[PDB]
Design a protein around this ligand. Structure first.
Ligand SMILES: CN1CC(C(=O)O)=Nc2c1nc(N)[nH]c2=O
Ligand SMILES: CN1CC(C(=O)O)=Nc2c1nc(N)[nH]c2=O
Lengths: 263, 263
């Protein structure tokens, strides 16, 4: 039982009711504009709407600098305006983070857990938004995957907390498919429960990734069942959100898991 | 680690390699014959073949008396002849069991765990085939679901062993959707691991069932994700086979689970 709720300004997310579903917003960028043009933003809104209907709880948006903003800001403007859901912003850059939250984004999603740009934690602290700290590194000289993962994630927490970030605005993420061989990803999957000793909600993103292809020997568009299995173990191992492409399918697996495990 | 293999005469099933997939053979019966006619047997063979291609390890066949045989015997004859896989026979009747094994079936699948016709365990003992003892009762006056389930299953084991059945020819099954309310099924799902103390391989059959519909509020043809989730937890909780309709989909989830848990 989490003794608090995830506060997202306008929106609130309860962590005891269900596994929360983060939908990956896919942005096929107009090869012709810098950003903001009708086709890409319309497609993003449309797609945000579909995922809202498929049972999504968060819309994840993003995926240099000067024009990271120009691409991402108009999408957040349009989506928050048109879809009643918390939007997480997918960046490791401090300036982008500010602009996006200023544009209407509610959560930070940092694939570098404040190590790329430590300044981001201050933006997170300033606007008081929840920040997702994901495990990542430039190397895989793991002495001991899980011990190092937990050590690394903790170094992220230090940076966040030292910048003013409240414990209740911290979410952790094992960072599957990042700085981890196919076997290390499996090992992380198998030991997810260990991240719980840190005392923070955990998000898992395994949607359609390489290690699934590695196991099943199947291309990206053929990874739904593989993804499902990772989401189920993830829920069984105690994670609070899952970051997925297939919102309809994963929502139903999430919900069935929830019922069975008693969430 | 199981220190033995599942011996099915012509075929052998290793229990340490993977979760074994039992495909439910669906028999749309010719409304016109008693059994044996071309359309129903052709459809069964065809369907057996499809599941063999989708990654199935066992074909489950069956689903009065005098004509249980007439329906089921010609199907086993044709399928064993045409598909190189162990066939389980789905009956609680002693006479049917004999005929089916005589017709080429390898495993007994008893939804009454030898309580309907105790004589079946002797057939099982005689032909030396593996028998699946499923949990079942006529009532749900459970004092304590899991304690009673284990007690009941044990009463099945007694009957089997007393009739000559070797420990290594015994498989257990929690019997989801039988003599259990929607909540009791969930409770069984949540406590599957407890069946392991009995020391026998466990098979789980949850494919497309009511309790999935109950949770997700969805019709039978819409229960793939729900089924998937039950199969994943089942594998996580240590079961050895799953009995499913959707062989292609469940095979892939099974295989991804296997990789992650380290089977
Ligand atoms: C922004 N991305 C991207 C990502 C990927 O591209 O695989 N995975 C993840 C991610 N964010 C989070 N929080 N977790 C992921 O696994
Ligand atoms: C023959 N049937 C039928 C069945 C069902 O109709 O739900 N479930 C099961 C079954 N056999 C086994 N071993 N397990 C089941 O759950």
């Amino acid at each position: 039982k989490w003794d608090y709720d995830l506060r997202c300004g306008e929106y609130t997310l309860n962590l005891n009711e269900k596994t929360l579903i983060m939908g990956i917003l896919n942005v096929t960028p107009d090869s012709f504009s810098d950003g903001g043009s009708y086709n890409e933003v319309d497609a993003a809104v449309r797609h945000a709407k579909e995922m809202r209907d498929e049972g999504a709880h968060i819309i994840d948006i993003g995926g240099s600098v000067e024009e990271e903003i120009k691409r991402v800001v108009p999408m957040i403007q349009a989506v928050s305006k048109e879809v009643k859901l918390p939007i997480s912003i997918d960046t490791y850059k401090a300036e982008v983070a500010k602009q996006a939250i200023e544009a209407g984004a509610h959560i930070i999603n940092d694939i570098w857990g404040a190590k790329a740009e430590p300044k981001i934690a201050e933006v997170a602290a300033h606007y008081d938004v929840p920040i997702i700290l994901m495990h990542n590194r430039d190397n895989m000289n793991y002495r001991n995957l899980m011990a190092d993962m937990i050590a690394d994630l903790y170094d992220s927490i230090k940076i966040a907390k030292d910048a003013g970030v409240r414990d209740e605005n911290i979410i952790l993420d094992p960072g599957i498919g990042f700085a981890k061989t196919p076997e290390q990803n499996l090992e992380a999957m198998r030991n997810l429960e260990q991240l719980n000793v840190l005392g923070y909600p955990v998000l898992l993103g395994t949607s359609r990734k390489s290690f699934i292809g590695h196991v099943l020997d199947l291309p990206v568009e053929e990874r739904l069942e593989g993804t499902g299995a990772t989401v189920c173990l993830g829920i069984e191992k105690g994670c609070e959100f899952v970051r997925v492409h297939d919102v309809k399918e994963m929502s139903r697996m999430a919900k069935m898991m929830d019922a069975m495990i008693g969430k």
